[PDB]
Amino acid sequence: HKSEVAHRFKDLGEENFKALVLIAFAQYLQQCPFEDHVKLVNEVTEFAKTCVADESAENCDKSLHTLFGDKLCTVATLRETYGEMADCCAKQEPERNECFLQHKDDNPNLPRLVRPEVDVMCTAFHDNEETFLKKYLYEIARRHPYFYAPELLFFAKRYKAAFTECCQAADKAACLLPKLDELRDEGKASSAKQRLKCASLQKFGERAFKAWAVARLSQRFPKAEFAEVSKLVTDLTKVHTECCHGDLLECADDRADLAKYICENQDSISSKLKECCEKPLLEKSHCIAEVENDEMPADLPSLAADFVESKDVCKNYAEAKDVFLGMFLYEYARRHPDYSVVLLLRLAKTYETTLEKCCAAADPHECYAKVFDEFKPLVEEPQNLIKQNCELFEQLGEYKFQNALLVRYTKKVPQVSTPTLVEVSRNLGKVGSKCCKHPEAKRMPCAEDYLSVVLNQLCVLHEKTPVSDRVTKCCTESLVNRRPCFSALEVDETYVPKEFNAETFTFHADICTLSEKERQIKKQTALVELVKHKPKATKEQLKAVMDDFAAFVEKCCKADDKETCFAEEGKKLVAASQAAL
Numbered sequence: 001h002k003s004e005v006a007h008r009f010k011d012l013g014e015e016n017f018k019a020l021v022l023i024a025f026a027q028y029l030q031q032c033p034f035e036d037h038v039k040l041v042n043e044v045t046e047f048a049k050t051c052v053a054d055e056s057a058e059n060c061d062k063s064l065h066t067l068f069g070d071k072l073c074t075v076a077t078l079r080e081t082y083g084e085m086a087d088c089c090a091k092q093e094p095e096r097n098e099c100f101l102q103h104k105d106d107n108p109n110l111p112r113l114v115r116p117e118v119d120v121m122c123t124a125f126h127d128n129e130e131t132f133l134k135k136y137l138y139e140i141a142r143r144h145p146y147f148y149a150p151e152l153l154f155f156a157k158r159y160k161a162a163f164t165e166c167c168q169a170a171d172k173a174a175c176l177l178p179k180l181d182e183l184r185d186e187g188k189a190s191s192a193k194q195r196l197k198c199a200s201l202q203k204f205g206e207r208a209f210k211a212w213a214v215a216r217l218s219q220r221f222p223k224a225e226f227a228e229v230s231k232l233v234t235d236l237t238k239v240h241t242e243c244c245h246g247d248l249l250e251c252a253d254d255r256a257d258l259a260k261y262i263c264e265n266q267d268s269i270s271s272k273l274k275e276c277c278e279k280p281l282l283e284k285s286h287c288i289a290e291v292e293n294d295e296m297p298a299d300l301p302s303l304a305a306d307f308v309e310s311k312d313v314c315k316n317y318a319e320a321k322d323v324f325l326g327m328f329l330y331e332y333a334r335r336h337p338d339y340s341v342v343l344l345l346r347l348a349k350t351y352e353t354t355l356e357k358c359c360a361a362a363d364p365h366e367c368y369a370k371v372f373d374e375f376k377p378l379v380e381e382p383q384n385l386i387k388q389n390c391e392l393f394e395q396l397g398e399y400k401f402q403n404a405l406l407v408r409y410t411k412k413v414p415q416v417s418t419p420t421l422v423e424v425s426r427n428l429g430k431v432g433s434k435c436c437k438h439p440e441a442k443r444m445p446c447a448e449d450y451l452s453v454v455l456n457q458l459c460v461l462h463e464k465t466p467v468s469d470r471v472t473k474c475c476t477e478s479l480v481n482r483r484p485c486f487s488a489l490e491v492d493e494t495y496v497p498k499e500f501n502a503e504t505f506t507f508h509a510d511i512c513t514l515s516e517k518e519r520q521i522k523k524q525t526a527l528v529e530l531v532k533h534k535p536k537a538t539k540e541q542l543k544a545v546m547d548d549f550a551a552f553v554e555k556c557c558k559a560d561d562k563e564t565c566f567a568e569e570g571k572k573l574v575a576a577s578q579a580a581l
């Protein structure tokens, strides 16, 4: 088409166009105030409308990069506020956009965003829904300049729906709060997944990413042909490489192209793509990215034939190693949607290590004839951990389950900071209440998805202020061995317990007037400090002390007079506990 802006404006729609332009500007000019951004959006939109009316109006022929760049260079304070970024304006567009990209700040220093009271939000929402939502949209985008724009818009729409619903209810707070917490967690998870995807692509390379995608796409589109799966994995790798570089326009066009390619060859890929392919341009790719697994052929051959029993295995493998291994991944993954992708990768790595050794020996067949027996122990490991932990989560509840994990991990890595241990254990706890509800067939994929982010949040932090070689080890190993590594950590027999600290175990009545989450976190913090002081303590000793603390807290919060009870009975509890331990 003769005009880029006009075309985009047309298939996006005015409302979507406006929100996206706002996000795009906020991610580049992270320091400019809201009023200035709104002003820019209005000018770009007004210009866009001119081009819609006549693709021949002036400047309507300019590319989007050029137009975006020219408007960015119009900001008068560009130099005084962003300094060096202002020098990007002296370059020819091609280089200009690259320069702006290089100067995008990922971890800016903006005040943390505080959640106001439910009634102020609801009142604000009713008085001016537009400015309320757009201002928060701006606040979120300036803080996450890397978050893929269209997905942020998808989140905004869900927030709107939460206010619309809850702000017109009897008990607003009881309605809205849980929705906001779920949205935030989900928002943070999405952010982590995006960063993880790019970092892994940079650290481990294209081959590893391609294997990961082959496995994932084969579980989802089992009826698709291997050649079709390879086509998709290739385009998908290119798409993420570009999206990770950070250029929104390039990223968006590649994704769109891929989404249409998929819809046009729908019948040749999966019968589950029907809905996704009838959705508007903006939602297509997102929908496809979450499509459920198509059902498998059910009348499929045995893997043993072509990969163990067959003659010429070594011959087909030597002829094209990666293609053969990819074929193996494809065949194995499409018969196992119940496996995590990383498990499939372990199987593949194991099959590769075996052919490398075995294909160089006299009688190949004999050497690699028992490969499938090496797979069994690899499979069972995550499966046992699932049942074992989910059952426990069932006996106890989410809270006591978190406490169980708390005792378990403080003992393995007592060096870690107490707030980190609490944070991590609580998140692990949630993965349990969220995945253990799924039937066995969907548990591993679920746990893998959530554990990948929790483990990455854990590693990133630790990276900053490292405290344990073991954690560093597990954090730097391959993403395939990451979870196994942590699971293999044993109690720290070297750790020297921390001296007693009266303060740490002193409690007041203010705990009675705290919110549930707040009470738990204070108790859990104490629970971690206890284990750090008495690491050799037993599950029984510990249970007894946690129970005394329990009755104690209920007793002191249920008395004609508090504070005294906590101080008087607190003296007791502490002294007794010490002796018992």
Ligand SMILES: CCCCC1C(=O)N(c2ccccc2)N(c2ccccc2)C1=O
Pocket (backbone or CB within 6 Å): 197, 217, 232, 233, 236, 239, 240, 254, 255, 256, 258, 259, 262, 284, 285, 286, 288, 289, 290
């Ligand atoms: C690496 C993360 C995986 C998310 C994902 C993605 O970005 N695309 C995706 C990319 C662009 C448009 C639509 C979907 N599809 C995808 C689905 C089937 C075949 C190929 C790719 C996905 O599953």
Ligand SMILES: CCCCCCCCCCCCCC(=O)O
Pocket (backbone or CB within 6 Å): 113, 114, 115, 116, 132, 133, 136, 137, 140, 152, 153, 155, 156, 159, 180, 181, 184
């Ligand atoms: C992209 C999301 C649109 C933003 C509009 C929703 C406003 C939510 C305000 C709450 C932000 C504070 C963060 C939190 O939830 O704790």
Ligand SMILES: CCCCCCCCCCCCCC(=O)O
Pocket (backbone or CB within 6 Å): 204, 207, 208, 210, 211, 212, 214, 230, 233, 322, 323, 325, 326, 329, 345, 348, 349, 352, 478, 479, 480
């Ligand atoms: C297009 C085919 C590309 C897939 C290549 C198959 C490679 C399988 C090896 C297992 C991948 C795990 C990589 C790793 O050890 O980090």
Ligand SMILES: CCCCCCCCCCCCCC(=O)O
Pocket (backbone or CB within 6 Å): 340, 342, 343, 382, 383, 385, 386, 389, 390, 428, 429, 431, 432, 435, 444, 447, 448, 451, 483, 484
């Ligand atoms: C304590 C976390 C709560 C979930 C309980 C199951 C434990 C997850 C282990 C299985 C991980 C599957 C991913 C992998 O293959 O490594």
Ligand SMILES: CCCCCCCCCCCCCC(=O)O
Pocket (backbone or CB within 6 Å): 385, 409, 413, 416, 420, 421, 424, 458, 471, 483, 486, 487, 488
């Ligand atoms: C440094 C923070 C403490 C370490 C947290 C351990 C994380 C391991 C998660 C793996 C879940 C499987 C259960 C397990 O084997 O521990």
